[PDB]
Design a protein around this ligand. Structure first.
Ligand SMILES: C[C@@H]1O[C@H](O)[C@@H](F)[C@H](O)[C@@H]1O
Ligand SMILES: C[C@@H]1O[C@H](O)[C@@H](F)[C@H](O)[C@@H]1O
Ligand SMILES: *[C@H]1O[C@@H](C)[C@@H](O)[C@@H](O)[C@@H]1F
Ligand SMILES: *[C@H]1O[C@@H](C)[C@@H](O)[C@@H](O)[C@@H]1F
Lengths: 427, 427, 421, 421
């Protein structure tokens, strides 16, 4: 039983389901999705994250302001996007089904992003999807659908930033230090809202962003204790600005700790019209990224930015479904695995290789499919055992040659693989 | 003049009236009195304190939950008891008169217990007796009546616990560390409410329970300074979780400091139907307890748990009135006394003895009436003086025999006493 | 048992012996006693406290600097007075006995004053009376003598100020906010020294001066708990800078406190310098009537003798106390401290159970006495010394009492009456 | 690289070797070993821990005070035991080898226990084993021997308690809240000594006891970062009083922890005083099944020999561990620790990938075994030693297994089964 102090909360280790899940879907959706626009040390003047629309708009003359004055006019307050956000083509079951086939094991929507708009029927502000726009509990309906599809549900909350409590935009990164809600009122609000999400939706992940208000950091002792005692399988990210977390997050990419890399299929998290497939990962690069991350002990949290009407952009769909097809073939070498002696190796040709492990098995995942039958892996040796082609299970001849390892794979099997050659060695 | 720091507030010593009062009446009354039910390390699963009804009810399947689903049904929220709490047979003057005859010198009702329901017309919540239930300022009406009877009035406030601000029950004692209001809002609320009680009712005791919110502990510097500067005769208990108090409290029973033992006539504080006179102190044991406590420097705060309709249970009445009859006879040996060289002694027969002191006089109070004329007190010697039978004032022969003291008391006088033989020695 | 937190240490109320004591003796004695000299918002430039000699000397061209540069020389360091401090005629038994006769109930010597010189054989500095000067544990020998005479023994310690750790003089009051040892080393040193006084001598009073080093204030919850648990009748003044004290100090309250002053002005002996016996009595009575103890300072000489003038006044106090002590010892405050007669004579009150002692600061010259703005419901007023019942009457707002001249002439210094109620 | 803040130090998870080790040896050895005596809410008055000898001795008239005033004399100071502590028959290689044979994977000696005596050549006190007694770096020579035998080496340090800094004995538990060194000087000393252990010996475990001085707790974020950066496979217990630990200690959790106890009751050697080999095995298994390591204490004699009784039991453990070690080393917890047969025999579980080891605390006498309130979906259950497949069946809430008597008779102390799923 967890007590509200850091020493006791350290007893809560990362839950097993999270280490085994490997792949989760982030969803950045809100009233910013309605305009759904961003540009192609002044990152905040030329912000490619469309979720940040309100911030960009508050910086007058920026590319986001100039786009806004054309489309909606100068007297359109950012706040009015909430009435246009009717999510009328939204089918939460379709989303859930899409995420399942993508091969995702958990799903995490933005319940409240930096703009302060809440995607549930919170008692603590009318600025929410039940009283405005969709007239719908979006978070609850999505949780229901996610779990009907057999998946786990978590919640994102923008604890550290809420532009309902500020009027001034972030122009440079140092503006983050002081352009914050700052009040005791806000500290209470954020604590009350995350408590509300815990009690209403029992999420398996609490995914905070942008730190936590200084005045509320001691409250997290109590929130984490409460959450873990009610829901021990629950897990917490590392963006709270306090000594406790269950896993770490990265956005720019062997650790003995659990972590999670998150990016969008493109550059933005929120839907961005102005993006296009030249800034987007191919199915191939998405598979390589997932494989690299997993070989290094991480989970991939891949983001989807839906349109204001509740449809997921065609490109995004295609990439998720292609990722899912790869995972349907090669999932055994990803789900439920642990890191091996090292993440990485390479062939003589220059093909990168990644290792995962399930018990005695070490999966050898090639980021690419070699052209010839003679594959030579550098700096690697294997004791006596059996090496097999993963997809067909076909036995393979292998030998140790100096410090390298020569494996011989029939062309017939190579032509069978998709994106990655995968082998499998039982020592 | 008191300043808001601990060093200065230490100048406020326990007021004289409190050391001299000896006997006070606690009143545990609220919407929990309406169901008025509790059971005969899992103390919170089988809670015999009926005031804790809401907590017990929130623990589903507990004896309190199962009782509730029969009597009121499953869709009866705890909060609905507030509308049934009409206190329609309440006569505050009868209560006050009863407390006077019981021999009490101060009276302290629960103004707000753990359930958060307020027995006065507070401006800071509608969850109170003026807007709901009785449609009456219960605290003000009772203070008025208590003081018309010549008694002192104090207030109990549940500062540390308020289940209006939590939804989750306390299952084990460690749940107390984190299942608390926790907010800055709550710290303000509690400070504002006790300030309100001070200004409205000018209580001679501030009786806090369950500690004080961590975020509000520095406020108590200001509250105590304010209270003492406005009302210097005022006094404060030791349940605030800060370095200052006027007296200490005990619930499980020679100190150089002032303290106060509190218990119910039975086991529960709030009315409990399910109790009955086998868990209740007799008049005899109530007198012995009072005498023991007073000989050790304490006051007894004896609790009464009224029914929802505002009547005090017959048993409770009988015991108070019997206590009062004893105090009408033997009050001189209790009221206004100080502790002697030691609290205690015993006879050859095994009868416990207790000492109190008024100036040069040392009262010798026997917890029982010995059968024979020759009483022998162990380990006690008296210099030359006069020993008298207390009730009749009759002179008595006494002598020092070794380390013991032989006193000879006529049977005629012994038959005169009630419950306790009391003697009286002027050295 | 006490725990090292303030909420627990509050259970330690002022011990009853201290409440009842009423009168104690301070002793300001050290190497500053050797020169024993002070002057006849520039208080530190012209300091009349002889104990502050080192500070005054560090202020160039001050009256003390001038005296020192004539009598001892400019290159005579103050610390060398330690070699001249021999205490050749010191008899702690004489001291103990004089204090007993004066009516005192406790005795408190300076174990270490601001100059940092220690009057016991401490292990944390060589700048002490065992290694230097007298070659004697002055604190230990006085404690034994004081206790053998039946008096309580306490200790003064200059925790907040130690001029072995600072070079710069205090010139103005604000200088006290920063010219302090300031180091962690000093915080440990002070803690270790008071613990040593506790372990060695188990004093009945811990009398700190000038605050406690900021870095060491959290040590005090442990020190107090340790002290109280070894010695529950011990007591602590209020010059430590923390939530807990047993009595306040000053140089009707509900709380216990203590007024301190010298028989003259300087605490340490001053040759270049006094309350009459009358004035000492009036002061005692005044202080007691307001809930206080008087802590009266004697400043002995380097050779350990208390000057005749001081010896004589303590004895005069003691004779008054032999006569009227029942109106002083073991008393508590009445509903007020003070009153006045129609002819301007001050009155003070004390209480013992049912008796109320009425102590006139003077002996009125007339039989008919009118006390202003007082009534009594007691039913007898008596002359205290004989208990003889007197005729009195509440007349409007005043109280009229007839004391026969024969009874007035029996009193010494103070007319004392006594209402039995 | 780790930074000196708690949020960063949390990246240092419990090292995998410690998770897999399961069994370590504590060694309580010092000058208290010389007298080596303890008694047969007054726990400190009648202390059975021989290591606490100095504390017990400081309590006048206690059983230890009496023994000391007969055997050594009243004026024999405890610190003089340092001269009698010569460790003449000490062979760290013998120690290293016995521990290896016992199946232990790490070894942790007391470098400094509560008495403040240091078993290495520390530069911050002369009260150590190089300047006194053995004239030898005991910590350094044991570390070399332990590592040469292929075992991990850690260090115990009594940070929270050091009786060279306190005079007053612990008499009741609450005394631990204030009878502590308490000074800044001690905070530096402890920090400097643990840094010295890190610099000199790079231990694999830092095993603090009795908390860390309050004034030094902020030093620990720097010490841990420094330690981890020099030695990433290092580890830290949970008796420092700060947010960061690698494992908890005790004398199904998701976290790593460690149970510690002696082969007998006293940690330090006690002449005036034991688990059978069976009991040690059951304890190991019990602890491991709940996610723990067992840290088993030996208390050697002043001459450096471990008594026969202790040598024999460690070896008995080691033989059991040679047989059944695959069910212990490198395992993780299953979905629960424990179960019981219908006839009252306790069961414990461990896990290695797909295999689930079923370890009976006893050898059941019958072929037909019924485990209460358990089912398995695994599809084969085997006798562990041979891997022989057994007949089993889920029957309602229970699990029925037939073990042929021939297979029961092959096991030593524990019947072990094994579900491959
Ligand atoms: C009693 C008196 O206290 C003051 O604070 C000191 F400055 C002075 O020297 C003397 O010790
Ligand atoms: C391992 C054990 O730990 C306790 O905390 C100590 F008090 C004891 O002496 C021994 O060292
Ligand atoms: C914090 O981090 C990520 C997850 C995005 O939500 C970004 O917009 C926010 F600033
Ligand atoms: C605190 O203490 C006593 C006075 C009762 O009110 C109890 O119910 C509460 F928990």
């Amino acid at each position: 039983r967890y007590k509200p102090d850091w020493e006791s909360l350290r007893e809560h280790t990362v839950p097993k389901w999270f280490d085994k899940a490997k792949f989760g879907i982030f969803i950045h959706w809100g009233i910013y999705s309605v305009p759904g626009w961003a540009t192609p040390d002044a990152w905040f003047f030329q912000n490619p994250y469309a979720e940040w629309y309100e911030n960009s708009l508050r910086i007058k003359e920026s590319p986001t302001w100039e786009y806004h004055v054309k489309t909606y006019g100068e007297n359109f307050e950012y706040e009015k996007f909430a009435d246009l956000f009717t999510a009328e083509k939204w089918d939460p079951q379709e989303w859930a089904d899409l995420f399942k086939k993508a091969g995702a094991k958990y799903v995490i929507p933005t319940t409240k992003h930096h703009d302060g708009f809440c995607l549930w029927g919170t008692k603590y502000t009318d600025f929410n999807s039940v009283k405005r726009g969709p007239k719908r509990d979006l978070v609850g309906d999505l949780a229901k659908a996610v779990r009907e599809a057999g998946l786990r549900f978590g919640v994102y909350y923008s604890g550290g930033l809420d532009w309902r409590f500020t009027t001034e935009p972030i122009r440079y990164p140092e503006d983050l230090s002081y352009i914050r809600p700052n009040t005791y009122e806000y500290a209470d609000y954020a604590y009350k809202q995350v408590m509300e999400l815990v009690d209403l939706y029992l999420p398996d992940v609490l995914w905070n962003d942008m730190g936590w208000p200084e005045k509320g950091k001691e409250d997290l002792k109590y929130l984490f204790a409460y959450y873990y005692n009610k829901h021990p399988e629950g897990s917490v990210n590392d963006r709270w600005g306090v000594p406790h977390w269950d896993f770490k997050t990265a956005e720019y990419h062997l650790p003995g700790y659990k972590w999670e890399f998150t990016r969008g299929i493109g550059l933005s998290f929120g839907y961005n019209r102005n993006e296009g497939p030249e800034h987007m990962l191919s199915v191939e690069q998405l598979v390589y990224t997932l494989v690299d991350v997993v070989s290094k002990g991480g989970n991939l949290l891949l983001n989807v930015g839906p349109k204001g009407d509740g449809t997921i952009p065609d490109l995004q769909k295609e990439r998720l479904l292609g990722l899912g097809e790869w995972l349907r073939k090669y999932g055994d070498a990803i789900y439920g695995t642990s890191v091996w002696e090292r993440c990485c190796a390479k062939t003589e040709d220059g093909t990168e290789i990644r290792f995962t492990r399930k018990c005695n098995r070490i999966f050898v995942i090639f980021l690419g499919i070699p052209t010839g039958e003679k594959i030579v892996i550098e700096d690697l040796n294997l004791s006596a055992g059996t090496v097999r082609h993963f997809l067909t299970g076909e036995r393979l001849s292998f030998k140790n040659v100096g410090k390298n390892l020569e494996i011989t794979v029939p062309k017939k099997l190579l032509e069978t693989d998709s994106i990655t050659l995968v082998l499998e060695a039982v020592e």
